[PDB]
Amino acid sequence: STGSATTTPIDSLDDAYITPVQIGTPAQTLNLDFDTGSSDLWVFSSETTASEVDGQTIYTPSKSTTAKLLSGATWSISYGDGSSSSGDVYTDTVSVGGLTVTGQAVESAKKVSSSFTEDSTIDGLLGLAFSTLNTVSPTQQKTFFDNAKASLDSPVFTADLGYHAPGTYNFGFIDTTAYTGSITYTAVSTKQGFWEWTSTGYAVGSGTFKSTSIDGIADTGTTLLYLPATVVSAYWAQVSGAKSSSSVGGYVFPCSATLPSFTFGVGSARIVIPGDYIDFGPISTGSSSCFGGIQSSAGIGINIFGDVALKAAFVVFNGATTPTLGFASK
Ligand SMILES: CNCc1ccc(Oc2cccnc2)o1
């Protein structure tokens, strides 16, 4: 089998991407944030504290003939941006782009933090990291991809995120019309539960490439590109007026600037992020200070190749017995 679904930016800045997901019988369609940095499939639901729901579409398990309470199971998760959610668990039928899994753990939110409530466009998350990170207790549950894998034509999924435009998540096949040149594959460590790999270096604009190992994660659920302070300082030094602002919480730059590109290495290959991808607009409405899309990972404890980086590529998440990642230009 295979699946193919369109993923759409939630706003004009590509702050996140949502993908429609069918849950239950008859289908309840919710728009979920596909997240290769976490491993829980959770949804706003009929169980979510009423004051914490504001415009989201909810899953109502009592209206699904295939829903079953997973007795005694609870979940609780925190994300790197300070947000969190928790609740109980059902199993139900889940389909993405024509690909169906029966008996998928669907984690129903009883509580969500303020930044979830405040984003009406995100109805929940669909985790695509390794199932070892799944938070369900006392019996850990499998991701949608792990449940689907045996049935897939090939044990892979691909992320093709758009810049200010829709893109695609495919399951079970590689669309050879969706990229240019060849796909360069690189080793993955699953020791931390992430799609963790090592970039071979970087360049800023038309500058010379610096060969240096940068260990990080391919994370569709993180908006920006978080890299070591040395690398980030080298980038923003090429933008007149750019500076790190403690009060804003990162590098900002004059909105009048034209930003240089940023290149990262994948083996001997190179992926170029155009300058415009790095502009996240005014820090507040009407400001002439703009927020940068490349930020320091110091304090996070890991480097993160988030959407800013991944949307410049066609990305293969290869879930064979020894997992690997593939990157192509597009
Ligand atoms: C804006 N905070 C709530 C929210 C929306 C989407 C996500 O999920 C995330 C956020 C950061 C990293 N990984 C996943 O959280």
DSSP track, 85-119: EEEEEEEEEEEETTEEEEEEEEEEEEEE-HHHHT-
Q: Which of 134, 125, 118 is nearest to 52 (CA)?
A: 118
Identical fold for domains 5-174 and 175-330, yes or no, is yes
The residues assigned a catalytic role are 35, 199
Which residue ranges have their beta carbon within 6 Å of ligand 1?
16, 33, 35, 37-38, 79-81, 83, 115-116, 119, 122, 125, 221-222
How many CA atoms within 13 Å lie on the side-chain side of 235? 30
Give nearest CA residue, ligand 1 atom 7.
Answer: 221
Longest alpha-carbon distance in the chain: 60
Burial class, 211, CB count within 10 angstroms (exposed 0-12 / middle 13-18 / buried 19+): exposed
Q: Which of 79, 15, 33, 41 is nearest to 307 (CA)?
A: 15
Q: Please calculate the CA angle 84-53-65 and round it to the nearest 5 degrees.
A: 95
- In angstroms, what CA-CA distances link 170 with 162, 184, 204, 314, 326? 14, 18, 31, 11, 14
What is the whole-number distance in angstroms between the Cα of residue 16 and the centre of ligand 1?
A: 8
Elucidation technique: X-ray
Paired tokens of 54: 């504001």
CATH class of 5-174: mainly beta
Q: Please calculate the CA angle 12-15-17 and round it to the nearest 5 degrees.
A: 95
User: In the CATH scheme, what is the homologous superfamily, with its name and number, of domain 175-330?
Assistant: Acid Proteases (2.40.70.10)
User: Residue ranges per domain, the chain?
Assistant: 5-174, 175-330
What is the whole-number distance in angstroms between the Cα of residue 78 and the centre of ligand 1?
A: 9
Centroid of chain to Cα 109: 20
Instruction: Give the residues across from 30 on adjacent strands.
Output: 21
What is the whole-number distance in angstroms between the Cα of residue 126 and the centre of ligand 1?
A: 11
